[PDB]
Ligand binder design. Structure first.
Ligand SMILES: CC(=O)N[C@@H]1[C@@H](O[C@@H]2O[C@H](CO)[C@H](O)[C@H](O)[C@H]2O)[C@H](O)[C@@H](CO)O[C@H]1O
Length: 133
């Protein structure tokens, strides 16, 4: 099961996305997206993309079909066959990514928070819960 849900209340500084899930034993990669529209080709304010196949975690945004400049977090705090907890925290200047007990990365806004409309979680991931606070 992939997660996809609209955000009718929008997201402001202090919005927290909590993702609890599991990386499958033969997983390659999964993703967390904050989209600015409802259909697949919409702009992405955030594309959070742990890649176990290439051993990296890529951050990026997407506008008018074009991926912006990639960012990467320090190491890979995900492991095949192991559960995880990710917090995506919105502030005025960006998104704070929290993995496990550690501040993992800070992704500064490319698109204004007011444009975020949808959260999507999918790929090689099994989900326990996806919550917006
Ligand atoms: C168009 C393309 O293949 N781009 C390459 C990157 O792969 C894409 O990365 C974006 C995020 O930036 C998405 O994760 C998308 O699903 C990927 O296909 C790739 O990460 C980089 C590595 O240097 O090369 C791009 O050319």
């Amino acid at each position: 099961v992939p997660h996809k849900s609209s955000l009718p209340e929008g997201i402001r500084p202090g919005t927290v996305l909590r993702i609890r899930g599991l990386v499958p034993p033969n997983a390659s990669r999964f993703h967390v997206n904050l989209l600015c529209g409802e259909e697949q080709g919409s702009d992405a304010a955030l594309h959070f993309n742990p890649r176990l196949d290439t051993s990296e975690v890529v951050f990026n945004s997407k506008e008018q079909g074009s991926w912006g400049r990639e960012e990467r977090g320090p190491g890979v705090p995900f492991q095949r066959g192991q559960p995880f907890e990710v917090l995506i925290i919105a502030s005025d200047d960006g998104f704070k990514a929290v993995v496990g007990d550690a501040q993992y990365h800070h992704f500064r806004h490319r698109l204004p928070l007011a444009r975020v409309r949808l959260v999507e979680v999918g790929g090689d991931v099994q989900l326990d819960s996806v919550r917006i606070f």
